[PDB]
Design a protein around this ligand. Structure first.
Ligand code: CLA
Ligand code: CLA
Ligand code: CLA
Ligand code: CLA
Ligand code: CLA
Ligand code: CLA
Ligand code: CLA
Ligand code: CLA
Ligand SMILES: CC(/C=C/C=C(C)/C=C/[C@@]12O[C@]1(C)C[C@@H](O)CC2(C)C)=C\C=C\C=C(C)\C=C\C=C(C)\C=C\[C@@]12O[C@]1(C)C[C@@H](O)CC2(C)C
Ligand SMILES: CC1=C(/C=C/C(C)=C/C=C/C(C)=C/C=C/C=C(C)/C=C/C=C(C)/C=C/C2=C(C)CCCC2(C)C)C(C)(C)CCC1
Ligand SMILES: CCCCCCCCCCCCO[C@@H]1O[C@H](CO)[C@@H](O[C@H]2O[C@H](CO)[C@@H](O)[C@H](O)[C@H]2O)[C@H](O)[C@H]1O
Lengths: 197, 194, 97, 152
C-alpha cells in the first residue's frame, strides 16, 4: 500500500495483504511469519483496549468541565470508596479475565476449535478469521470489510499514542489532560513543553 | 470430553479407563507400571479423603470444637481423650499409638500381599456385602462417580488445610459463617494482598 | 514395671516377625543373594572365612524360624521397650510442641 | 531499622564526618588570598561536599555505627533503588551489546573469509545492525520460542 517514508523501499516480507500495511518495520521484528501473526494479534488487542481506556479517561473530564456530572479525575479514581473493597473486585476481574483470555488463547492456537458453546450445545460461532470472532460479537451485523479494519487499526494506533501522551504529560505536570489543553490554548506561545524547565 | 478443548490428547490416555479426561501436562505416566501404581495410589487417596471429610465436618456442627483442637490433648502431659463428651478410660498417647500402629500395619500388609493387578484397586467379594458390583453395566458408572467424588474430596481437604493455615484456630464451618456474614468484605482478597 | 513392658514388647515383636513379615523378609532376602565379587560369591572367589553357616540356620520349626530371626526380633523389641521406659521415666513436657 | 541500622539523617557520626571534612578543607583554604583562584576552587569544593552530604541525607540511606552508608540488597521495597534498578539497567545494556555482537557475527558468517571482516570491520553493516538492539528482549524471547537460539 502506502509508504511510511518516501524514498525507502518497503520490506520484502510485508506484501500489503494485511490491513493497515505501510511497510513500517525498520528494526526487522516481523521477519518470521509466526512472529508476524503473533504481533498482529497483539497489536489488535493492545489498542482495542487502548481506545476504551482513552475514552474513559477523556470523556468524563470533558463532561465534568461542562458542568453536568461531577466525577473524580482518572488519577484519583482509585482513592474513592466503592461498595466493595478493591481486593474483591480484583479477584473477580482476575477470574473472569483468566477464563476469557484462556478461551482466546485456545482460539489462537487452534483456529475454529472453541467456537462451540460449552453449556448450551445448540449455539456456535460462525466460521471466520482469527481476531474477528463475529457472530454474537457482531450483533448489528456489520460487514468486516477491509476499509473498516483499516479505520479500526488507525484509531487504535492513535489511541495508543494518546494514552502514552496522557501518562507522560500527567507525570511531568500534576494537572490532567483537559486542563493542560485549556492552559495551552490560553497562551500557545508561553505554555508549551519547552517553556516548562 | 477433554480437560481443555483444542488440546491434543496424549497417546497413553485414550479414554477407556474410568475418569479418563486426558490430563497429564507433565507426562508422568508414560511408563505403564508407573501408570498402574499411580492409579492405585490415587484411588487409595480418594477413598481416604472421602472417609475423612465427614469426620472433619460432623464436629463443629455439634457442641464439639473442631478437628484441629481434637488433637491438642496429646501435647499436654497426662492428657486424656474424650468421645462425644465422655472421657475414655484407655485414652493415653502410648497405648493408643501402639494399637493404631499394630492394627494399621497389619491391615496395610494384608492389602499389599495381593498380586492380581485388578484386585489391588477393586477387590470385591467380602468387601461389598450389598452386591452392587454384580451387574457390569452399572459398574463403570459407579467407578466414574467414585473417582469424581474422590477428586472433589481431595480438593476439599486441600481447601480445609489452606483455610486453617490462613486463619489459625478456625474451623471450616465458622469460616463459612464468617463469609456469609458479609460476603463483600470477608473474602480471599484481603489475605492475597495484605 | 520394667518386666511387664519388656515381655510385652519382645512378645509382640516376635509375633510380628513370625506370623506377619516372614514372607516379605524371605522374599527380599531371596531377591538380594549373597554378596559377589567379579560375578562370584566371596567363598567361591577363594575366601574360606566367608562360608555360610548352613548347619546353624537349620531348624525344626514348621515355617523355618531360626535363631538369627529370634535374635533380630528380640533386639528390636528390647530397643523399643527400653525407649518406652526411658521416655516415660523423665518428666519432659513439650509445652505446645 | 534493618539489622540494627540508623537512618543517615538521624546519625551523629555523619555530621561529625562532615565537620571534619569541612575543617580539613578550611585549614588549607586559610592560606591563600581571598581573591585568588585557589580560594574559589576550595569554596566550590566545600559547597560540593555540603551538597553531597545533604543529598545522602535526603535519599534515606542507613549509616552504620561507624557513620558510613550501607547498602541493602535484600529486595526490600524501601531500598530498591540501591541495587535492583541499576541491575536491571545493566542487564539491559549488556543484553544490547551481546545481541548486537552476535547479530554481526551471524551476518558476516555467510561470506567466504569472515576473518578479513573481523580484522577489518565494515561500518555500514554494523551501523545497520547496532540499532536493532533497542528491542533485544522481544527478539531473544521470540527466537527462544521458535528454537533458533541454540545451535543443533
Ligand atoms: C475500559 C475500561 C474502563 C474502566 C476500567 C473504567 C473504570 C471506571 N470508571 Mg469509566 N468509562 C469508560 C471505561 C472504563 N472505565 C468508558 C468507555 C466510559 C464512557 C465515556 C466511561 C465513563 C464513566 C462514567 C460516566 C463513570 C465512570 C466511572 C468509573 C469507575 C467506577 C467503575 C464502575 O462503577 O463500573 C472506574 C474507575 C464512575 C466514577 O465514579 O468514576 C470515578 C462514573 O461515574 N466511567
Ligand atoms: C470505532 C472504531 C472501531 C471500528 C471502526 C471497528 C471496526 C470493526 N470491528 Mg472492532 N472493536 C473496537 C473498535 C472499532 N472496531 C473496540 C473498541 C473493540 C473492543 C470492544 C472492538 C472489538 C471488536 C469485536 C469483538 C469485533 C469487531 C468487529 C469489527 C468489524 C465489524 C463491526 C463494525 O463494522 O464496526 C464499525 C463501528 C463503528 C461505526 C463505531 C461506532 C461508534 C461506537 C458506537 C462508539 C461507542 C463509543 C463511545 C466512546 C461510548 C469492523 C472491522 C467484529 C468483526 O470483525 O466480525 C467479523 C467483531 O467480531 N470489533
Ligand atoms: C498524539 C498527539 C499528542 C498531542 C496532540 C499532544 C498535545 C499536547 N501535549 Mg502531549 N504528549 C504526547 C502526545 C500528544 N500530546 C506524547 C506521546 C508525549 C510523550 C513524549 C507527550 C508529552 C507531553 C509533555 C511533556 C507536555 C505535553 C503537552 C501538550 C500540549 C502542548 C504541546 C507541546 O508542547 O508539544 C509536546 C509534544 C510532544 C512531547 C511530542 C509530539 C506529540 C505527537 C507525537 C505528535 C504527533 C498539547 C495540548 C505540554 C503541556 O503540558 O502543556 C501545558 C507538555 O508539557 N505533552
Ligand atoms: C497425589 C495424588 C493423585 C494421584 C497419584 C493421581 C494420579 C493420576 N491422576 Mg488424578 N487427580 C488428583 C489426585 C491424584 N491423581 C486430584 C486432586 C485431582 C483434581 C485436580 C485429579 C484429577 C485428575 C484428572 C482430571 C486426570 C487425572 C488423571 C490421573 C492419572 C494420570 C496422571 C498422572 O500420571 O498423575 C500422577 C500424579 C502424581 C504422582 C502426583 C504428583 C504430585 C506432585 C508431586 C505434587 C505437586 C503438588 C500439588 C500440585 C499441590 C493418574 C492415575 C488422568 C486420568 O485419565 O486418570 C486415569 C486425568 O485425566 N487426575
Ligand atoms: C477416617 C478416620 C477417622 C479418624 C481417624 C477419626 C478420628 C477421631 N475422631 Mg472422628 N469421625 C469420622 C472419621 C474419623 N475420625 C467419621 C466418618 C465420623 C462420622 C461418624 C466421625 C465422627 C466423630 C465424632 C462424633 C467424634 C470423633 C472424634 C474423634 C477423635 C477421638 C477418637 C475417639 O475417641 O475414638 C474412641 C472411640 C471408639 C468407639 C473406639 C473404637 C479422633 C481424632 C471425637 C472428638 O471429636 O473428640 C472430641 C468425637 O466425639 N469423630
Ligand atoms: C472445593 C471447593 C472450595 C470451596 C467451595 C471453598 C469455599 C470457600 N473458601 Mg476455600 N479454598 C479451596 C477450596 C474451596 N473453598 C482451595 C483449594 C484453597 C487453596 C487455594 C482455598 C483457600 C481459601 C482461602 C485462602 C480462603 C477461602 C475462603 C473460602 C470461603 C469464601 C470464598 C472466597 O471468598 O474466596 C476464596 C477463593 C478461592 C480459593 C476459589 C475457590 C474455588 C475452588 C478452589 C475451585 C474449584 C471448586 C469447584 C470445582 C466448584 C468459601 C466458604 C475464604 C474465607 O475463609 O473467607 C472468610 C478465604 O479466606 N478458601
Ligand atoms: C541375648 C539374649 C537375651 C535373651 C534371650 C533375653 C531374654 C529375656 N529377657 Mg532380656 N536382656 C538382654 C538380652 C536378652 N534377654 C540384655 C542384653 C539386657 C540388658 C539391657 C536385657 C535386659 C532384660 C531385663 C531388665 C529384663 C529382661 C527380661 C527378659 C525375659 C522376658 C521374656 C520375654 O522376652 O518374653 C517372653 C514372654 C512372652 C509373653 C512372649 C527373657 C528371659 C525381663 C524378665 O526378666 O522377664 C521376666 C526383664 O525384666 N531382659
Ligand atoms: C561478541 C560478543 C560475545 C558474546 C555474546 C560472548 C558470549 C559469552 N561469553 Mg565470550 N568472549 C568474547 C566475546 C563474546 N562472548 C571475547 C571478545 C572474549 C575474549 C576476551 C571472550 C571470552 C570469554 C571467556 C573467557 C568466557 C566467555 C564466556 C561467555 C558466555 C557467558 C557470558 C559471560 O560470561 O561473559 C564473559 C565476558 C567476557 C570475558 C568479555 C566479553 C566482552 C567483550 C569485551 C565484548 C564483546 C563485544 C564485541 C567486540 C562486539 C563487536 C560487534 C560489533 C563489531 C558490531 C557467553 C556464551 C564464559 C563462558 O564460557 O561461559 C559458558 C567464559 O568463561 N567468553
Ligand atoms: C493498552 C494501553 C492502555 C490501556 C489503558 C487502560 C486499560 C486504562 C484504564 C483506566 O483509564 C481507565 C479506563 C479509567 C481509570 O479510572 C482507571 C484506569 C485503569 C487508569 C496502551 C497501549 C499503548 C501502546 C503503545 C504506546 C505502543 C507503542 C508502540 C510503538 C511506538 C512501537 C513502535 C515500533 O514497533 C514498531 C511499530 C515497528 C518497529 O520496527 C519499530 C518500533 C519503534 C519498535
Ligand atoms: C521354645 C518354644 C516356644 C517359645 C519360644 C520363646 C518364648 C522364645 C523367646 C525368645 C526371646 C524372649 C528372645 C529374646 C531375645 C532378646 C534379645 C536379642 C535382646 C537384645 C537386646 C539388646 C540388643 C539391648 C541393647 C541395649 C543395651 C544392652 C543397653 C541399653 C540400650 C539397648 C536397649 C539398645 C514356643 C512355645 C513359641 C513354640 C515351641 C518352642
Ligand atoms: C587391632 C584391631 C583388630 C584386632 C584383630 C585381632 C585378630 C586376632 C586373630 C587371632 C587368631 C584367631 O584364630 C584363628 O582363626 C583362624 C580362622 O579365622 C584359624 O585358621 C587359620 O589357620 C588355619 C591353620 O593354618 C588355616 O587352615 C585357616 O585357613 C586360617 O584362617 C587359626 O588357626 C586361628 O588361630
Amino acid at each position: 500500500k502506502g509508504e511510511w517514508l518516501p524514498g525507502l523501499a518497503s520490506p520484502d516480507y510485508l506484501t500489503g495483504s494485511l490491513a493497515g500495511d505501510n511497510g513500517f518495520d525498520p528494526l526487522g521484528l516481523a521477519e518470521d511469519p509466526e512472529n508476524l501473526k503473533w504481533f498482529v494479534q497483539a497489536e489488535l488487542v493492545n489498542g482495542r483496549w487502548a481506545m476504551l481506556g482513552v475514552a474513559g479517561m477523556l470523556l468524563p473530564e470533558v463532561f465534568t468541565k461542562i458542568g453536568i456530572i461531577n466525577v473524580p479525575e482518572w488519577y484519583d479514581a482509585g482513592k474513592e470508596q466503592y461498595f466493595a473493597s478493591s481486593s474483591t473486585l480484583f479477584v473477580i476481574e482476575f477470574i473472569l479475565f483468566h477464563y476469557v483470555e484462556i478461551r482466546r488463547w485456545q482460539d489462537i492456537k487452534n483456529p475454529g476449535s472453541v467456537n462451540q458453546d460449552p453449556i448450551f450445545k445448540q449455539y456456535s460461532l460462525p466460521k471466520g478469521e482469527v481476531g474477528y470472532p463475529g457472530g454474537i460479537f457482531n450483533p448489528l451485523n456489520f460487514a468486516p470489510t477491509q476499509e473498516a479494519k483499516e479505520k479500526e487499526l488507525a484509531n487504535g494506533r492513535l489511541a495508543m499514542l494518546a494514552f502514552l501522551g496522557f501518562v507522560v504529560q500527567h507525570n511531568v505536570t500534576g494537572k490532567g489532560p483537559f486542563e493542560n489543553l485549556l492552559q495551552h490554548l490560553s497562551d500557545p506561545w508561553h505554555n508549551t513543553i519547552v517553556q516548562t524547565f | 470430553a477433554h480437560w481443555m478443548p483444542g488440546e491434543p490428547r496424549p497417546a497413553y490416555l485414550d479414554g477407556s479407563a474410568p475418569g479418563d479426561f486426558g490430563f497429564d501436562p507433565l507426562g508422568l505416566g508414560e511408563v505403564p507400571a508407573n501408570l498402574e501404581r499411580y492409579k492405585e495410589s490415587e484411588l487409595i487417596h480418594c477413598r481416604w479423603a472421602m472417609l475423612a471429610v465427614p469426620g472433619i465436618l460432623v464436629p463443629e456442627a455439634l457442641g464439639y470444637g473442631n478437628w484441629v483442637k481434637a488433637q491438642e490433648w496429646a501435647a499436654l502431659p497426662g492428657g486424656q481423650a474424650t468421645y462425644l463428651g465422655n472421657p475414655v478410660p484407655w485414652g493415653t498417647l502410648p497405648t493408643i499409638l501402639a494399637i493404631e500402629f499394630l492394627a494399621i500395619a497389619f491391615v496395610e500388609h494384608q492389602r499389599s500381599m495381593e498380586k492380581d493387578p485388578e484386585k489391588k484397586k477393586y477387590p470385591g467379594g467380602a468387601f461389598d456385602p450389598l452386591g452392587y458390583s454384580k451387574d457390569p453395566k452399572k459398574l463403570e458408572e459407579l467407578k466414574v462417580k467414585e473417582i469424581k467424588n474422590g477428586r472433589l474430596a481431595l480438593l476439599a481437604f486441600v481447601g480445609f488445610c489452606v483455610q486453617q493455615s490462613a486463619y489459625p484456630g478456625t474451623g471450616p464451618l465458622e469460616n463459612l459463617a464468617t463469609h456469609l456474614a458479609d460476603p463483600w468484605h470477608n473474602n480471599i482478597g484481603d489475605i492475597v494482598i495484605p | 514395671s520394667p518386666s511387664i513392658v519388656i515381655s510385652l514388647s519382645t512378645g509382640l515383636s516376635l509375633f510380628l516377625g513370625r506370623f506377619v513379615f516372614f514372607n516379605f523378609q524371605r522374599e527380599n532376602v531371596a531377591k538380594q543373594g549373597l554378596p559377589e565379587q567379579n560375578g562370584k560369591t566371596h567363598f567361591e572367589a577363594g575366601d574360606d572365612r566367608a562360608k555360610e553357616y548352613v548347619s546353624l540356620l537349620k531348624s525344626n520349626d514348621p515355617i523355618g524360624f531360626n535363631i538369627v530371626d529370634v535374635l533380630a526380633w528380640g533386639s528390636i523389641g528390647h530397643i523399643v521397650a527400653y525407649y518406652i521406659l526411658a521416655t516415660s521415666s523423665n518428666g519432659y513436657d513439650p509445652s505446645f510442641f | 531499622d534493618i539489622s540494627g541500622l540508623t537512618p543517615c539523617k538521624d546519625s551523629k557520626q555523619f555530621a561529625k564526618r562532615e565537620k571534619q571534612q569541612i575543617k580539613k578543607l578550611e585549614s588549607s583554604l586559610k592560606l591563600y588570598a581571598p581573591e585568588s583562584a585557589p580560594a574559589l576552587a576550595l569554596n566550590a569544593q566545600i559547597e560540593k561536599t555540603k551538597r553531597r552530604f545533604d543529598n545522602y541525607g535526603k535519599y534515606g540511606l542507613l549509616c552504620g555505627s561507624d557513620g558510613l552508608p550501607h547498602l541493602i540488597v535484600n529486595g526490600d521495597q524501601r531500598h530498591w533503588g540501591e541495587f535492583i534498578t541499576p541491575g536491571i539497567l545493566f542487564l539491559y545494556i549488556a543484553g544490547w551489546i551481546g545481541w548486537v555482537g552476535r547479530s554481526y557475527l551471524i551476518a558476516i558468517s555467510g561470506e567466504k573469509k569472515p576473518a578479513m571482516k573481523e580484522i577489518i570491520i565494515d561500518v555500514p553493516l554494523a551501523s545497520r545492525i547496532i540499532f536493532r538492539g533497542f528491542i533485544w528482549p522481544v527478539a531473544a524471547y521470540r527466537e527462544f520460542l521458535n528454537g533458533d537460539l541454540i545451535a543443533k
